[PDB]
Amino acid sequence: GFRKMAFPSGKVEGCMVQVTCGTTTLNGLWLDDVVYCPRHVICTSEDMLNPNYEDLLIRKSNHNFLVQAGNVQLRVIGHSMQNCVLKLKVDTANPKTPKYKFVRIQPGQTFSVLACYNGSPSGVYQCAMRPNFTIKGSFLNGSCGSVGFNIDYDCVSFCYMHHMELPTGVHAGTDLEGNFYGPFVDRQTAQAAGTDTTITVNVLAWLYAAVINGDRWFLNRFTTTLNDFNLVAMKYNYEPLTQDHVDILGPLSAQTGIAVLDMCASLKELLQNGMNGRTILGSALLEDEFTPFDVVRQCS
Amino acid sequence: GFRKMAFPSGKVEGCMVQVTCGTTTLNGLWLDDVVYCPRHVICTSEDMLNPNYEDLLIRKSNHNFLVQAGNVQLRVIGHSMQNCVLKLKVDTANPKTPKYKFVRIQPGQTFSVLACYNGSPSGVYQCAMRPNFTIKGSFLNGSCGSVGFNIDYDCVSFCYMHHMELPTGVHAGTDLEGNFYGPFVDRQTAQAAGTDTTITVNVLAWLYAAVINGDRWFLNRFTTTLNDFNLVAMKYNYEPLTQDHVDILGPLSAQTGIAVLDMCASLKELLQNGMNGRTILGSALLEDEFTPFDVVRQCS
Ligand SMILES: [Cl-]
Ligand SMILES: [Cl-]
Numbered sequence: 001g002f003r004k005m006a007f008p009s010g011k012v013e014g015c016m017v018q019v020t021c022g023t024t025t026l027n028g029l030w031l032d033d034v035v036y037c038p039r040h041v042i043c044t045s046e047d048m049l050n051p052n053y054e055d056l057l058i059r060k061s062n063h064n065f066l067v068q069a070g071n072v073q074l075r076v077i078g079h080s081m082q083n084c085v086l087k088l089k090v091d092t093a094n095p096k097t098p099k100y101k102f103v104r105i106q107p108g109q110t111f112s113v114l115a116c117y118n119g120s121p122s123g124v125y126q127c128a129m130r131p132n133f134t135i136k137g138s139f140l141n142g143s144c145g146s147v148g149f150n151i152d153y154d155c156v157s158f159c160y161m162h163h164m165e166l167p168t169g170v171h172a173g174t175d176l177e178g179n180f181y182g183p184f185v186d187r188q189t190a191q192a193a194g195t196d197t198t199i200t201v202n203v204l205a206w207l208y209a210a211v212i213n214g215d216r217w218f219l220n221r222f223t224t225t226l227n228d229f230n231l232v233a234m235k236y237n238y239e240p241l242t243q244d245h246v247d248i249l250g251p252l253s254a255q256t257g258i259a260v261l262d263m264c265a266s267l268k269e270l271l272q273n274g275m276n277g278r279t280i281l282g283s284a285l286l287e288d289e290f291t292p293f294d295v296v297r298q299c300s
Numbered sequence: 301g302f303r304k305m306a307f308p309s310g311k312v313e314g315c316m317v318q319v320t321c322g323t324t325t326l327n328g329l330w331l332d333d334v335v336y337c338p339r340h341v342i343c344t345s346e347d348m349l350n351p352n353y354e355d356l357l358i359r360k361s362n363h364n365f366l367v368q369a370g371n372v373q374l375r376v377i378g379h380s381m382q383n384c385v386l387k388l389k390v391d392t393a394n395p396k397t398p399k400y401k402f403v404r405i406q407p408g409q410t411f412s413v414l415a416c417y418n419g420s421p422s423g424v425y426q427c428a429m430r431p432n433f434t435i436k437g438s439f440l441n442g443s444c445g446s447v448g449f450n451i452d453y454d455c456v457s458f459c460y461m462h463h464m465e466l467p468t469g470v471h472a473g474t475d476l477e478g479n480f481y482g483p484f485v486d487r488q489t490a491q492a493a494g495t496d497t498t499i500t501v502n503v504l505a506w507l508y509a510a511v512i513n514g515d516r517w518f519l520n521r522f523t524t525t526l527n528d529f530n531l532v533a534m535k536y537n538y539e540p541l542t543q544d545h546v547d548i549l550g551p552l553s554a555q556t557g558i559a560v561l562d563m564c565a566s567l568k569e570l571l572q573n574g575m576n577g578r579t580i581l582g583s584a585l586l587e588d589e590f591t592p593f594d595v596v597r598q599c600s
Contacts (some may be wrong), residue, residue, distance in 0.1 A: 003438035005423035008414065011309030104598075114308065123305035123598070124424055136582070138303035138598060160557040169301040169513060213469060274577075274585075282436070284584030298423070298438060 001213045002281050004289070005298060006112035006124040009149045014096030018119030019088070019145065020066040026068060027087065027116040027145030029176070031156070035067055035074070036176055037145045038163050040186050048188040057081055068119065069094075083178030084186050085161065098156045102176040105159040107131045108199045108239075110291055111148040113160070115139060128289040129157070129160070131197040131239060132172040133182025133183055133193040136289075147176075166193055168264050198238045199288040201245040204263055205250050206287045208252040209295045210280045217278060219258070222265040225297065229264040236271050301513045302581050304589070305598060306412035306424040308311070314396030317374065319445065320366040327416040327445030328367060328388065329458070329476070332398050335367055335374070335388040336476055337445045338463050339381055340486050349399030357381055369394075381536065383478030384486050387459065398456045402476040405459040407431045408499045408539075410591055411448040413460070415439060428589040431497040433482025434470040436589075437462070447476075466493055481590070486536040498538045500590040501545040503560060504563055506587045508552040509595045510578045510580045516577060519558070522565040528562040536571050548592050 018029040022044060028037035040048065042056050060079070065088050069075040078089035096140045105111060115138060127135040127148060127214050139146065139162055148160030152172045162173045163186050170193065172184040186193055205217070230240045246260045253260050267286075275284055303353030318451050319328040319337045328337035340348065342356050344516040365388050367374040378389035405411060407429050415422045415438060427448060439446065439462055462473045463486050470493065472484040474567060483489055484502070507518070530540045547559045567586075575584055 001436075001465075003425045003436075004304060005415070005425045005438060006306060008310075008421035009308045010313040010421070013308050013310040057519055081368060115305070121310070122309035124308055125303045125305045136301075136303075138301060138305060140600070165301075221326070277574075279585065282585070286580070287577065292501050 002209050002298065004126050005294075006126045006257060007149070009112065009114045009121065009124045011098040011151065011154075011156050012114050013121045015098075015147075016119050016121060018066075018068045020068075021060065021064055025118060026142060027119050028149055028224065029145065029161070030067075030069060030090070030094040031100060033090055033093045035090055036161065037088070038161065038174075038186065039084050039086045039178070040144070040163070041065075041086065052290070053081065053186075060225060061131070081178075083174070083181060084163065084174050085178030088242060090176075094206050099154055100156045100158060102268055103127050103159050103201060104156045104175045104177075104179070105181075107133060108202065108291065110289060111150050111159050112296055113137055113148045113162075114146060116146040117142045117145055124295075126289065127160075128202070128291075129181060130170075130201065131199065132193040132195060133180075133184075134166055134172055134193045136159070137171040139165065139171055148173075166191060167191070170196075178285050185238050195237055198236070198241045198286070200233055200241050200249065200267075201292065202288040202290055203238075203267060204241075204245075204249055204260065205292040205295045207263055207283070208256055209250070209269065209299065210259070210289065211256050211258060212295075212299050213281065215280055218266050218270055218280065219262075220266055222269075223259065223262045223263065224265045224268060226264075229261070231269060232268050232271060248257045251296060252292060253266070302509050302598065303399045304426050306426045307449070309412065309414045309421065309424045310451055310455075311398040311451065312414050312447065313421045313445075314417050315398075316414070316419050316421060318366075318368045320368075321360065321364055324444060324554055325418060325518075327419050328369075328453065329447055329461070329536070330369060330374075330390070330394040330446065331400060333390055333393045336461065337386050337388070338461065338474075338486065339384050339386045339478070341365075341386065350487060353381065353486075374424060374432060381478075384463065384474050384480060385478030386414055387474070399454055400458060401460050403457045404477075404479070405429050405474045408431060408509055408545060410589060410592065410594055411450050411459050413437055413462075414446060415443055417439040417442045426461075426589065428499065428502070428591075429468075429481060431486075431499065432493040432495060433480075434466055434472055434493045435460070436494070437471040439471055441467065441591075444455060445575045448473075466491060467530070468493070469564065470496075476544070488504050496542070497539055498586070500533055500535070500539045500541050500567075501548065501592065502588040502590055503538075503567060503586050504545075504549055505552060505559065505592040505595045506590045507589065508558070508564055509599065511556050511558060512552075512595075512599050513581065517578065518566050519562075520566055522566045522569075523559065523562045525561065526564075526570060529561070529568060532568050532571060538571070551596055
């Protein structure tokens, strides 16, 4: 009774366009009279290993950028590079521009991804910005410039633009000012994300979700302390739990009558002893891609 | 690198309205000049245990059905009950009606759910119509009349309308002609779904997806026969695999160079021996809610 849920994507579908430079085609985000897209649209297959973006860009004029919205060709009247994204000024404002903002999201927070190909929406799914600043997406060639977002009432907060795949099949991108999340660079090399630490607060949130939905086998008669919990968390590459994490979990704790440190005691045994074949909300692993706010919103 | 993915929901968002009868409010689907909704919108909290729908309906006139689309009130000019859904004729065609069809989906197939409350889209997620004709959704009070759908190019095939929750937290509903999937009835009793059998063909599909994405530890040097595989499948309440299942898996088999019966040999050992702590595409359980077509579409 508890699902990984993405926001409705209608307001973002109307912002997706196709951007082509030469033989390279990817997606752009069309808001007011600007199309945002990854700068590596100007790269050929040769250039992607060590691109000199400033030098490659100087070779490109407005008319080299083919921007298409359905059957309609948009007229490019200006271009500039801001960090790792290109801003293509077009001579038409997008009539479907929603209320929007750009935000740089924190590690541990979630957002929906509208995977796109050739400017056309393909599918929607929920991601978390991991502590090592990667995401576990589903992206193929041609998906760059797909965006991640949250919706707040009727306002769309864009937080992610897709640029690349990392060694382990995880994904890296930028905010809409073109700065990467994490230490990554838009070049076709193997780059390391460090240790993939687990978002402890999100695991606790999800264990509360499990209690709300009738899954309680993992509750025990014990409690712990923050410092003693974190001694175990560390060994398992879990993020240290802080008092502010504890306060953020207040509402779920209160709704369930399970003190946060009692739930930590249960988590401690799950980490040391495992699940011995049992499941929690239909998973045999501890899920860390629901925030406290995500649990509250879905369970109300 | 492989995610549970829902279709983009924009075309369905524009079809959702609020329907209220008395103190009961749920969602309706507004296509052309008709609003489809669950008939139990005419029930009070008392009536929901053993409703006599024909008798309750005879007490209701057009003006008792409050249909609202955003700030705009729709004028109800006719109503009729078709099986478990009500059809409310309104005096305005929905300008946002997409190309659409109604389809009764087969067990084992998947679709996206646009969960809605008060006629407002809340979130989107992918479901499968299970063999016991339930789904594993995420639905609260007020979510009835939320729909499930597939998109084929620009045509929306509506296949599910939400009506109720079953003992184990799973969900039951109807097609858009108002016939339940499965043996369920729209009355507030505890009703059984039988044994929840696993969609074998979908598990195989997903194991192929795992190979495509570099997860191959579970491959072995063995093969099996259809009849010998099914002797093991049965004990685990897996669906019997048929030759037509084998042919549907052809393209994935061919793309990976793993004969379907070789993959069955691998599945056989996973069922008998378990996963011994290992994971497959980030799950410690065998996933059966991807069809062969879903894997092909996402991996291309
Ligand atoms: Cl006890
Ligand atoms: Cl070997």
